[PDB]
Design an enzyme around this catalytic site. Structure first.
Site, PDB file in Angstrom:
ATOM      1  N   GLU A 130     -85.469  64.454 -14.802  1.00 37.90           N
ATOM      2  CA  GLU A 130     -84.277  65.013 -15.390  1.00 37.90           C
ATOM      3  C   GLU A 130     -83.056  64.789 -14.496  1.00 37.90           C
ATOM      4  OE1 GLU A 130     -85.100  68.985 -16.531  1.00 37.90           O
ATOM      5  OE2 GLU A 130     -83.231  69.328 -17.658  1.00 37.90           O
ATOM      6  N   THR A 172     -81.635  73.971 -13.214  1.00 39.17           N
ATOM      7  CA  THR A 172     -80.443  73.235 -12.762  1.00 39.17           C
ATOM      8  C   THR A 172     -80.877  72.144 -11.758  1.00 39.17           C
ATOM      9  OG1 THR A 172     -78.066  73.481 -12.070  1.00 39.17           O
ATOM     10  CG2 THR A 172     -79.742  74.812 -10.851  1.00 39.17           C
ATOM     11  N   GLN A 173     -80.217  70.994 -11.842  1.00 36.20           N
ATOM     12  CA  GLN A 173     -80.553  69.798 -11.026  1.00 36.20           C
ATOM     13  C   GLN A 173     -79.384  69.406 -10.163  1.00 36.20           C
ATOM     14  OE1 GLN A 173     -81.400  69.525 -14.776  1.00 36.20           O
ATOM     15  NE2 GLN A 173     -82.968  70.753 -13.699  1.00 36.20           N
TER      16      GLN A 173
HETATM   17 CA   LIG Z   1     -80.435  69.914 -20.672  1.00 35.50          CA
END
Ligand SMILES: [Ca+2]
Ligand SMILES: Nc1ncnc2c1ncn2[C@@H]1O[C@H](COP(=O)(O)O)[C@@H](O)[C@H]1O
Length: 419
Positions: A130, A172-173
């Protein structure tokens, strides 16, 4: 110029979006060539929201899939790849029930296979996937993978890349190119793109997406205060406790209770600060919760709910956010508004309105105390959700990878002229 098409269903925790991409057949390996053709937002919750009624998950895609049939020319349906990628909503359901997760994936697979697109599968992306595919999307769209200069005069150092920060609903990334030595294999990413090596750091914080943080703050407020200091004074709601504590993210905290807001920016700050454990670090340097992170560096694009929250602060509150100090000030002013004052600023629909104070406070703490941005590094962050007419997220990078549209090397190694 004959065009080709590809479709990605982004099956996020809070909803599904469909993106249709198009590119010239004869130029398909050029960086930056693929762009968005159309998109569609699927009505209702994410596919993980159908854990107890998996048949509905497939049916939820039908209207957007019908749009895809109109968006992509008929003669090209058969050779247009379609992928579905699911993120943290499905990662969380898989902790709770791998069986229910598999039934949802089965139901979406059954629906998608009924359509004339070349369906290539429904998969749950890793948190690394992701983060990395979002970083690829932004840099691909902005042409940062071009080797700038010309023979005998190459720009040195190589053109910088844009770090990515994605705040979705459930995780969250953060992802960026780094020169620091890797200390944790889980965070280490090496890409070979257009003949170049990129050393990249990534991490995904599960349970640190917007919706999960809001649930965690609500659980915490219930326990510690019996009022909600982040909610505006005059706002109240009947909280169903079962929904509060059912999440993997809140089970650790702990039928209906009335909960009212108090506009207490300082107590809200204190409540948010409890989300970040800075007590321990088994590495030379950490972000938080003992996660390895090298110093942030270079420019960043902060998209998804970072963008939506900052857009609220600038466009609705009318406040500057150019510095961390400005962001902190804007958060304070926002959190100090009563419910009538906040409503007076938003003539239309009020969904999410009571939550901006908490999200803004979270963002400010995440950046300053979580990732350790300071005024110098924060100046390099931009808040945007689109580049080159294309939505920024992981979907494009995912499609580029699975369709093999980014070459590891240039054709004929460009005669070795980039060696
Ligand atoms: Ca998303
Ligand atoms: N206009 C908005 N303001 C604040 N949050 C939003 C808005 N639109 C979507 N969100 C939330 O942002 C998170 C990630 O959204 P997305 O990246 O669009 O899936 C979810 O919690 C959404 O509910």
């Amino acid at each position: 110029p004959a065009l080709k098409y590809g479709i990605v269903l982004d099956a996020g925790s809070s909803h599904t979006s469909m993106f249709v991409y198009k590119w010239p057949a004869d130029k398909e390996n050029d960086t930056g060539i693929v762009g968005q053709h159309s998109s569609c937002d699927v009505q209702g919750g994410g596919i993980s929201s159908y854990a107890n009624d998996p048949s509905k998950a497939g049916q939820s895609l039908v209207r957007c899939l019908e749009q895809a049939l109109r968006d992509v020319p008929r003669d090209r349906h058969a050779s247009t790849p379609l992928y579905l990628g699911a993120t943290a909503g499905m990662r969380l359901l898989n902790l709770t029930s791998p069986e229910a997760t598999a039934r949802v994936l089965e139901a979406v697979t059954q629906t998608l296979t009924q359509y004339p697109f070349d369906f290539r599968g429904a998969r749950i992306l890793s948190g690394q996937d992701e983060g990395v595919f979002g970083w690829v999307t932004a840099n691909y769209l902005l042409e940062n993978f071009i080797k700038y200069g010309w023979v005998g005069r190459w720009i040195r150092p190589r053109k910088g890349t844009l770090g990515a920060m994605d705040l979705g609903g459930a995780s969250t990334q953060i992802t960026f190119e780094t020169t620091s030595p890797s200390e944790d294999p889980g965070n280490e990413v090496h890409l070979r793109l257009y003949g170049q090596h990129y050393r990249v750091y990534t991490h995904s914080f599960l349970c640190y997406g917007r919706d999960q943080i809001l649930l965690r703050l609500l659980a915490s407020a219930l326990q510690i205060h019996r009022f909600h200091p982040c909610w505006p004074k005059g706002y109240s709601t009947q909280v169903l406790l079962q929904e509060v504590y059912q999440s993997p993210c809140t089970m650790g905290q702990r039928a209906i209770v009335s909960l009212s807001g108090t506009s207490n920016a300082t107590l809200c700050r204190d409540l948010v600060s409890r989300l970040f454990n800075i007590s321990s670090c088994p590495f030379s340097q950490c972000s938080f919760n003992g996660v390895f992170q090298p110093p942030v560096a270079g420019n960043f694009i902060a998209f998804s709910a970072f963008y939506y929250t900052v857009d609220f602060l600038t466009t609705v509150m009318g406040l500057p956010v150019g510095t961390l100090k400005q962001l902190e000030e804007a958060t304070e002013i926002t959190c100090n508004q009563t419910w009538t004052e906040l409503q007076a600023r938003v003539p239309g629909q009020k969904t999410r309105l009571a939550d901006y104070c908490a999200v803004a406070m979270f963002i400010h703490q995440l950046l300053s105390r979580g990732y350790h941005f300071d005024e110098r590094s924060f100046r390099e962050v931009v808040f945007q959700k689109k580049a080159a007419d294309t939505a920024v997220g992981w979907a494009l990078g995912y499609m580029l990878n699975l369709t093999n549209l980014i070459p590891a090397d240039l054709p004929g190694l460009r005669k070795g002229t980039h060696f």
